[PDB]
Amino acid sequence: DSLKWIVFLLFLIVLLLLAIVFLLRG
Amino acid sequence: DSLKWIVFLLFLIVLLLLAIVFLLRG
Amino acid sequence: DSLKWIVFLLFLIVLLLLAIVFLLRG
Amino acid sequence: DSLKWIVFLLFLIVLLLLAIVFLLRG
Amino acid sequence: DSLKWIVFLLFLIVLLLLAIVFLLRG
Numbered sequence A, B, C, D, E: 001d002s003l004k005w006i007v008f009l010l011f012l013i014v015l016l017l018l019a020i021v022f023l024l025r026g
């Protein structure tokens, strides 16, 4: 359903922001 | 409906975060 | 109602990420 | 109310991205 | 609850953007 896609995309956004945090720290 | 818009905008946010990750890395 | 604010704020987030992409690319 | 909390956190995300945009301009 | 997961992930996204703001300042 729609809510499952919303949770999935928010989880990808968390993973991408994690990458950005690590790239900035480096 | 609103949920279709929400999913679409979250997907655009994923794409823009991917672009940022790629710009940071390069 | 909440759903209309949610769509509006996601849309501002899209615009703000576009601005970040633009600044990084410069 | 979960929906109201969602509006609030999206609003903080807008604020934080505006802060980032400002820091990136200087 | 799906809404609870959404609130949780949005909170993580806030914390990650706070981390990014702090890294940009120093």
Ligand SMILES: CCCCCCCCOCCOCCOCCOCCO
Binding pocket: B005, C001, C004, C005, C007, C008, C011
């Ligand atoms: C509206 C259909 C879905 C398209 C999403 C784009 C939304 C763009 O918003 C335009 C900016 O509107 C300016 C003023 O907005 C008032 C805030 O609306 C909050 C709800 O009461």
Ligand SMILES: CCCCCCCCOCCOCCOCCOCCO
Binding pocket: C012, C015, C016, C019, D021
């Ligand atoms: C390089 C600078 C780019 C500036 C991006 C600004 C995006 C808009 O966010 C401003 C938020 O503060 C105002 C609240 O939103 C106003 C509603 O009108 C938005 C027009 O669509």
Ligand SMILES: CCCCCCCCOCCOCCOCCOCCO
Binding pocket: C001, C002, C005, D004, D007, D008, D011
């Ligand atoms: C606008 C900044 C003021 C700071 C207070 C928090 C505002 C965040 O949301 C502002 C938009 O209005 C929120 C509406 O959504 C929840 C309120 O519910 C009202 C009755 O259901």
Ligand SMILES: CCCCCCCCOCCOCCOCCOCCO
Binding pocket: none
């Ligand atoms: C920099 C972010 C906050 C700066 C001023 C905050 C002052 C707190 O009061 C805000 C009151 O505003 C009420 C709701 O904001 C506008 C949304 O309502 C318009 C249509 O619903």
